[PDB]
Design a protein around this ligand. Sequence first.
Ligand SMILES: CCCC[C@H](CN(O)C=O)C(=O)[C@@H](NC(=O)Nc1ccc(C)cn1)C(C)C
Ligand SMILES: [Zn+2]
Length: 185
Amino acid sequence: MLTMKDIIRDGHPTLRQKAAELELPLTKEEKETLIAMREFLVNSQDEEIAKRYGLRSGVGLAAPQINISKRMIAVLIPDDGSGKSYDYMLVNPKIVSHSVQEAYLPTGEGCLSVDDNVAGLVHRHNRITIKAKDIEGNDIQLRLKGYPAIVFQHEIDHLNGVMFYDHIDKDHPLQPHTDAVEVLE
Ligand SMILES: CCCC[C@H](CN(O)C=O)C(=O)[C@@H](NC(=O)Nc1ccc(C)cn1)C(C)C
Ligand SMILES: [Zn+2]
């Protein structure tokens, strides 16, 4: 069972490397890793388990964040109210197209690997199309908009050694770009 002790923190070299593409099929160990990544997210969202193991609640996890420099991510976004929910373990995910129009969470973003909150808007594409493999090497193509698009972009960033605060404007951290879409958490 993964817990916070498995999450490496900002400053660790692995978070700034470019993660390696997976060979398909995955090894048993790689499959177990990705399953445990998803399981971390599940536990972090269970009030009781999270309390018992001091888990910070999360909706996304990238393998580099547990010091595994591989292009695997997990995303677990529970139902918001619209009936839409996201439960994906992706191998070699790639953004193949996206909107010109941007979006941002009005609070900025946070990160499991980052202890202190960083104020500032993180502009991302409002819509994206992702191609990936699943855990069994089958094909997945996702069309995502708004909140889940933001989360996936955040996770994919980790695989290229990019941190959310890299996107924050130094001089005007809280000024939205013209026409950018405010996304409700
Ligand atoms: C936008 C990218 C977020 C990635 C980041 C983990 N990460 O470091 C990933 O690489 C999170 O998951 C944030 N926490 C979060 O979202 N908590 C949350 C929010 C809503 C619901 C319903 C439950 N839990 C962090 C601020 C911890
Ligand atoms: Zn993160």
